[PDB]
Amino acid sequence: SKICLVCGDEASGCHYGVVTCGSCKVFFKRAVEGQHNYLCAGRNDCIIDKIRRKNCPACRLQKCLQAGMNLG
Amino acid sequence: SKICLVCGDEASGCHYGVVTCGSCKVFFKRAVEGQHNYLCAGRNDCIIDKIRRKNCPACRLQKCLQAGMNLG
């Protein structure tokens, strides 16, 4: 496939176990080892797409997890 | 109140008609004047508080207008 399983932007290959775009790749790496205080403002099922992926990083991260992205 | 009617943060007085913090004051004018494409990732009722006011500018603008802000 050529679409990111997380946001639907054009995929640049398989990153951390899942086919993702470059911004989802580094969002995930940064989420896992960084210092964020993400919090959903809706009901933990925000729509994650290219247009809205910056809106709820907390749902973005959860969607990354469910798709199976991992470091290990 | 010292409280912002849009986001609950400590308010710096009445701006464009409504008691607001400084961030919402300048968020509101930037929104209205420079219209661009804000879209809710939930169901257009995102909680707007200090921790989460960057998440959904569409709802943030929506709460601003309801609360009564304007430039006229």
Add this chain to the structure above:
DNA sequence: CAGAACACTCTGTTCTG
């Protein structure tokens, strides 16, 4: 492919008449 180093978005603060 994983990471680094860059550049961008947008926001929020401080300063002013």
Add this chain to the structure above:
DNA sequence: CAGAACAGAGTGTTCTG
């Protein structure tokens, strides 16, 4: 008070093993 404008976190792209 409204507005100018600098500084910042968070994000995204380009590049370099």
